[PDB]
Amino acid sequence: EVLADQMEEMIAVVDRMEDEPRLALVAFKEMSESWDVVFSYICDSMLI
Amino acid sequence: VAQKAVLGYLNNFEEVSNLEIIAGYQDGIDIENDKTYFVARTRMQPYR
Numbered sequence: 001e002v003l004a005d006q007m008e009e010m011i012a013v014v015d016r017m018e019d020e021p022r023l024a025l026v027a028f029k030e031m032s033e034s035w036d037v038v039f040s041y042i043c044d045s046m047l048i
Numbered sequence: 049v050a051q052k053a054v055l056g057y058l059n060n061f062e063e064v065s066n067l068e069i070i071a072g073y074q075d076g077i078d079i080e081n082d083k084t085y086f087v088a089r090t091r092m093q094p095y096r
Contacts, residue, residue: 047066047092
């Protein structure tokens with residue numbers, strides 16, 4: 001990304017089982033205490 | 049040591065199983081007998 005702003009307040013990551021694939025997910029954030037701004041990606045374990 | 053070696057081979061074999069086709073070209077007009085060629089690349093970076 002080339003973001004219009006410096007989203008930089010760290011990362012959140014977990015494995016998901018809301019379903020059987022056991023998906024990989026990563027997220028990042030910026031502290032609008034309301035309307036908090038987030039950037040993220042999700043991947044199939046085969047890196048898809 | 050042999051275990052290490054085979055694990056390396058297996059590791060590369062992972063990428064083999066993750067190879068993605070990109071394009072192909074026919075050797076000639078007779079699909080039913082002419083050979084054909086294909087090109088593919090790694091999902092993992094660096095792209096190979």
